[PDB]
């Protein structure tokens, strides 16, 4: 019921990274940002997003061996929504004030306040590390920021222009696509979910990629 | 140089869970909360903390296959500090405003604002035994229930039950370790042995509030439930 698109890949089949800002339909509503397992899409992104705007999510707070989780169940209207992951578990790691607002074992329908789509390239002798230093400018604050991305590990015997974008996926992720040395290839750096759902939209629109420096570090 | 102790375990050898609130010593200082790999201690906790108050940490921002990390190197004064993990890597996951403050590949000494110590115990499926730990936020007067998975049990002639009985007391405490963790100890288990369950609450929190949460989140009680799978 409110969207934002980050288009890193424009292609016939592409990986879809979906993240949603939710709010519980109950008397102690918790606000949550969760993301879907990745899936493949063959329809235009602007068109997938519209269909995703009909998303209906149901969560249920549960315990698991690897900490507490949320058993998610989702639905949407549209042909392209047949491939949408319907039932998946997520780590119920929330802002500490939200823990009180998380009723255990109560199947609650959540209400989508924003739906984010990120397009990606479908997935399908040893020293020095090739690392890419992605340079950005926070236009809200006019303060630079450099996020390092590990690329390859090369061996040493005794790129010019690439694109980087801040996208909302595992909270926020930086995705960098290299054009040639190979070919179109993406590196994802996870920045973590520790952030206000409101600021997620803010960061993406204010963090402008300035340039990329490739460095080499002996191991 | 400030300290706080959470004594879940009191024993001859015990697991030490150390977490520190740091601030870089540079011209764009980043504030950081990192925790040490767990280690064993044989000296009193109040005594280990004193020695830990002499902690000197050096971080260096680096890239890794599993996102960006911080190459940590640490030292402290005192005999018990021989066992302290000296060189360890940590995930460099910070509050977003902090990313600008983190300088790539610049070896910076960090300054310890607070040292936290937490003591611990050294270490065909139908239903799940889950413990609902009940707490009260005294600052806000609002309850909070954190569910801990204990074990999977098998019931012959089984249904899909709820609340359970032994086979009544246990203690639970909110402690600063992987940011904040709830640690629950089963006194007279099935009523094996004294056994602890750690629930990770995540590092998503202001270093200041970490001290606040621990002092205000009081354990009210524990309900044992059963959930069919
Ligand atoms: Ca609720
Ligand atoms: Ca700095």
Residue numbers in the entry:
A (entry chain A): 1 to 124, 138 to 171, 187 to 209, 217 to 254
B (entry chain C): 1 to 123, 138 to 181, 188 to 211, 217 to 254
Article, verbatim:
In this study, we solved the X-ray crystallographic structure of the M protein from HMPV at 2.8 Å resolution. The P31 crystallographic asymmetric unit contains flattened, diamond-shaped M dimers. The M dimer is stabilized by a large network of conserved hydrophobic interactions with a buried interface area of 1,421 Å2 per monomer. Each domain consists of a twisted β sandwich, in which the β strands in the opposing β sheets are approximately orthogonal to each other, and a few short α helices. The binding pocket adopts the classic Ca2+ pentagonal bipyramidal geometry, with an average coordinating distance of 2.4 Å between Ca2+ and interacting oxygens. Binding involves the side chain carboxyls of Glu24 and Asp26, the backbone carbonyl of Leu28 and Lys101, and two water molecules. Dimers pack crystallographically through a relatively large (624 Å2) NTD/NTD interface that is stabilized by polar interactions, propagating a helical arrangement within the crystal.
We show that HMPV M is a dimer, both in the crystal and in solution, and Ca2+ stabilizes the structure.
